[PDB]
Design goal:
Oligomer: monomer
Number of helices: 4
Radius of gyration: 20 Å
CATH architecture of the largest domain: Beta Barrel
Keywords: fragment screening, method development, aspartic protease, hydrolase
Number of domains: 2
PDB class: hydrolase
Strand content: 35-45%
Name: endothiapepsin
Entry title: Automated refinement of diffraction data obtained from an endothiapepsin crystal treated with fragment 195
Shape: globular
Assembly: monomeric
Length: 330
């Protein structure tokens, strides 16, 4: 089997991407944030505290003939941005882009933090990291991908995120029309539960490539590119007037600037992030200070190849017995 679904930016900055997902019988379609940095499929629901729902579409298990309470199971998750959610668990039929999993754990939120409430466009998350990170207790649950894997034509999914435009998540096949040149594959460590890999270096603009190992995670659920302070300083040093602002929470730059590109290495291959991808616009409405899309990972504890990086590439998440990651230009 295979699946193919379009993913759409939630706003004009590509802050996140939503993908429609069919849950239950008859189908209830919710727009979920596919997150390769976590491993829970959770939704706004009829159980979510009413004051914490503001415009989201909810899953109502009592209206699904295939829903079953997973008795005694609870879940609770905290994300790198400080947001969180928790609740109980149903199993139900879940379909993505024509690919159907029966008996998928659908984690129903009883509580969500303010950032979720305030984002009316995201109805929940669909985790695509390794199932060892799943938070359901006392019986850990499998991700949608893990459940689908044995039925897939090939044990892979691909992320093809757009810049200010829709893109695609495919399951079970590699669309050879969706990228240019060849795909370069690189080793993955699953030790921390992430799609963790080592970039071979970077360049700023038309500058020379610096060969250096940068361990990080491929994370579709993180907006920006978070890299070591040395790398980030080297990038922003090439933008007149750019500076790190503790008050704002990172590097800002004059909105009048033209940003240089940023290149990262994948083996001997190179992925180029155009400068425009690194512009996250005014820090507040009408400001002439703009927020940067490359930020320091210092104090996160891990480097994160978030959407800024991933949307510059066609990315293969190879979930074979020995997992790997593939990157191609597009």
């Amino acid at each position: 089997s295979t699946g193919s679904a379009t993913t759409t930016p939630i706003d004009s900055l590509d802050d996140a991407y939503i993908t429609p997902v069919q849950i239950g019988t008859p189908a209830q379609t919710l727009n979920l944030d596919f997150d390769t940095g976590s491993s829970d499929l959770w939704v706004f629901s009829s159980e979510t505290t009413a004051s914490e729902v503001d415009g989201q579409t909810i899953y109502t298990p009592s209206k699904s003939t295939t829903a079953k309470l997973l008795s005694g199971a609870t879940w609770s998750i905290s994300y790198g941005d400080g947001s969180s959610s928790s609740g109980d668990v149903y199993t139900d039929t879940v379909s993505v882009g024509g690919l159907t999993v029966t008996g998928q754990a659908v984690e129903s939120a009883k509580k969500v933090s303010s950032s979720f409430t305030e984002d009316s466009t995201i109805d929940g998350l669909l985790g695509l990291a390794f199932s060892t990170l799943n938070t359901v207790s006392p019986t850990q649950q499998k991700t949608f991908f893990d459940n689908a894997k044995a039925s897939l034509d090939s044990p892979v999914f691909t992320a093809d995120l757009g810049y200010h435009a829709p893109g695609t998540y495919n399951f079970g096949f590699i669309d050879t029309t969706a990228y240019t040149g060849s795909i370069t594959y690189t080793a993955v460590s699953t030790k921390q539960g992430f799609w963790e890999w080592t970039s071979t270096g970077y360049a700023v603009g038309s500058g020379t490539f610096k060969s250096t190992s940068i361990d990080g995670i491929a994370d579709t659920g993180t907006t920006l590119l978070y890299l070591p302070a040395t790398v980030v300083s080297a990038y922003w040093a090439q933008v007149s007037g750019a500076k790190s602002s503790s008050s704002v929470g990172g590097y800002v730059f004059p909105c009048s600037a033209t940003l240089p590109s940023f290149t990262f290495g994948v083996g001997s291959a190179r992925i180029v992030i155009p400068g425009d991808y690194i512009d996250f616009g005014p820090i507040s409405t009408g400001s002439s200070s703009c927020f940067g899309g490359i930020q320091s990972s210092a104090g996160i504890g891990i480097n994160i190849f978030g959407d800024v990086a991933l949307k510059a590439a066609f990315v293969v998440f190879n979930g074979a017995t020995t997992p790997t990651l593939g990157f191609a230009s597009k």
